Structure 1
C-alpha cells in the first residue's frame, strides 16, 4: 500500500492517480510552495 498524496486512497501514487493533482503544498495545504519547500510544519 501507498497513500496517494493527490486523492488519499492507497494502492497507487500522485502521478498514477486518475484525478487532477494539487499545485500547492500537499501536507500543510498552503500554495506558493510545495510540501518539499514548506517552512510551516516541516519535519515529516
Structure 2
C-alpha cells in the first residue's frame, strides 16, 4: 500500500509523517547509507 519515505510505515506519506526524516535511504529502502549518499541517481 501507500507508505512513507521518512519512516516507511504504510497508510501515510512523509508529508503526513511528523517523525522527521531518517538517516537510511529515503528512497531505495536500504540503510547502509543515506538519501544523499545513495548511488541510485549516479
For 1:7 and 1:24, how far apart are their aligned partners in 2?
A: 9
- List runs of 5+ in structure 1 lacking aligned partners: none
Q: Tell me the number of residue pairs that the alignment of Structure 1 and Structure 2 aligns.
A: 42
> How many Å separate the matches in 1 of 2:36 and 2:2?
18
When normalised by structure 2's length, the TM-score is 0.48
2-structure distance, mates of 1:8, 1:25: 10
Which runs of 5 or more structure 2 residues have no equivalent in the other structure?
none
1:5-39 CA distances to partner (integer Å, 9 max, x unpaired)? 00010000001012112589623589999969976
> When the two structures are superposed, what TM-score results if normalisation uses the length of structure 1?
0.47
In our comparison, the structure showing a higher alpha carbon Rg is: 1
Partners of 2:14 and 2:37 lie apart in 1 by 17
Point out the more displaced range, 8-17 or 18-27: 18-27
